[PDB]
Amino acid sequence: FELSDVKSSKSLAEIYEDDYTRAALSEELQKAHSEISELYANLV
Amino acid sequence: KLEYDEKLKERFRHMPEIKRISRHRHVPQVIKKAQEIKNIELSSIKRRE
């Protein structure tokens, strides 16, 4: 766990709304894989 | 040239950036600090007045 030190920009209703809507490993890491793939292809 | 640009400085001495270039010196630190505290004393006594 990371224990996010910032306040938020949400509410408890938005927290429980994301918990209601969530109900494919990590999307930021998927975006990182995609951008490093594009940059490696440009380099080659 | 010297009298012409001196007359230009005299005519434009109220513009703010050439005022803040023509004004400042390297006043020694003793005189600067003591004039600063004299200025805050005079502002305080004007407030009480």
Partner: protein, 182 residues
């Protein structure tokens, strides 16, 4: 303009016409003027290589060091950079930040590989030879003097058959076996 005096340089110590802060300070034209690259805007390519490999190097290193995607793209990047031959020893992993520079990425060029192979006196006529089109690498002739001979092609960058320089080399050695054309 006119090698301004003291009282004019102090008023304008900022203006300069022939170089601005978009060419990274005469670097492109300086290294092109010393290293014979004929097509323009190629130190953009050289320094973009030497900055881009470190860019995606840190972009690959800040990834969490457990996933096999990291090992895959690390090994592909290192072996791709080794197979063209700017890295001599492939075992270097994270210290590609400091060594692969202009002086190494231009060391794969066919003029300096020619001069280190002692096929020419200097670069000044090595570019003349490989622009006249006397020098093949592998089976096919190569004419552009910005070619990077790779690792697996440095062994076979030799003169063509039926050329004046190959003829005069074999004449001076006096071994001109004239059955196979020269």
């Amino acid at each position: 303009v006119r090698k301004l005096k003291h009282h004019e340089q102090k008023l304008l110590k900022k203006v300069d016409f022939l170089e601005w802060k978009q060419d990274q300070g005469h670097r492109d034209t300086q290294v092109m003027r010393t290293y014979h690259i004929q097509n323009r805007e190629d130190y953009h390519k050289y320094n973009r290589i030497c900055g881009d490999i470190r860019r995606l190097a840190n972009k690959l290193s800040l990834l969490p060091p457990t996933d096999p995607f990291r090992r895959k793209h690390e090994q592909l990047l290192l072996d791709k950079l080794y197979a063209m031959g700017v890295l001599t020893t492939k075992s270097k992993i994270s210290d590609l930040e400091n060594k692969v520079t202009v002086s190494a990425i231009c060391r794969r060029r066919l003029p300096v590989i020619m001069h280190r192979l002692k096929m020419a006196e200097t670069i000044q006529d090595a570019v003349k030879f490989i622009e006249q089109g006397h020098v093949r690498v592998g089976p096919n002739l190569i004419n552009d003097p910005a070619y990077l001979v790779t690792r697996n092609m440095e062994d076979y960058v030799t003169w063509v058959d039926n050329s004046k320089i190959k003829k005069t080399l074999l004449r001076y050695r006096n071994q001109i076996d004239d059955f196979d054309f020269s």
